[PDB]
Write a protein that binds this ligand. Structure first.
Ligand SMILES: [Cu+2]
Length: 229
């Protein structure tokens, strides 16, 4: 249970919920056929469009509830340690990131932090060690203009049962300058890109001792692979 609720650009804090389409509550989306999969449950909206440069180092901030910890010494801030899984980030080009409908957009993945088997480290583990932040660079080659930037935590502690993977998603509204001429060879739809039977979604991550180490095996995230310039 957590909410992506703040963006940084080269370390510059854009402010709580600035530029975000974020859910009001921290409950997961679990039906991958749902429209809630695109930017999370419909919640807050923003008129701001965050100015970024292609190549910029983006930070996305998760906390347990809107505003941070739910109470002093919250064990589950930024997210509960049990919620092992990958973090993924996608872009969709839009004409106007403040007014574009989220329905039927053309998405492509730019970054993911999944699972390192020899260090036994999930993307959510790095999110936790980074105090809620995940960091990635926008590709240098993407074209100028508005985009929706969707960041997604997939928590797998219950994903051994059908439809019980948990997704925590929000979208950020950005405008890119200094870009290039890249166009993706292939895009995906949300909902639609993920199936409940995907090996990264219907999965038992529990090893012999009962620890969520995926039995030391490599993990395959759902969705397309990150693009490369
Ligand atoms: Cu939770």
């Amino acid at each position: 249970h957590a909410i992506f609720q703040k963006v940084s650009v080269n370390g510059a804090d854009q402010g709580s919920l600035t530029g975000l389409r974020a859910p009001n509550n921290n409950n997961p989306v679990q039906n991958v056929n749902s429209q809630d999969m695109i930017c999370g449950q419909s919640g807050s909206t923003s008129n701001t469009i965050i100015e970024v440069k292609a190549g910029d180092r983006i930070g996305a901030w998760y906390q347990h509830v809107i505003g941070g910890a739910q109470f002093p010494n919250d064990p589950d801030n930024p997210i509960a340690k049990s919620h092992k899984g990958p973090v993924m980030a996608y872009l969709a080009k839009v004409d106007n990131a403040a007014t574009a409908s989220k329905t039927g957009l053309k998405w492509f993945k730019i970054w993911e932090d999944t699972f390192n088997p020899s260090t036994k480290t999930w993307g959510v583990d790095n999110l936790i060690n980074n105090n809620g932040w995940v960091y990635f660079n926008l590709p240098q080659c993407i074209a100028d203009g508005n985009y929706l930037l969707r960041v997604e935590v997939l928590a797998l502690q219950s994903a051994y049962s059908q439809g019980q993977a948990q997704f925590y998603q929000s979208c950020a509204q950005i405008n890119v300058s200094g870009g290039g001429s890249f166009t993706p060879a292939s895009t995906v739809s949300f909902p639609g890109a993920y199936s409940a039977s995907d090996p990264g979604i219907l999965i038992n991550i529990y090893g012999a001792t009962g620890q969520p180490d995926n039995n030391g095996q490599p993990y395959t995230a759902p969705g397309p692979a990150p693009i490369s310039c």
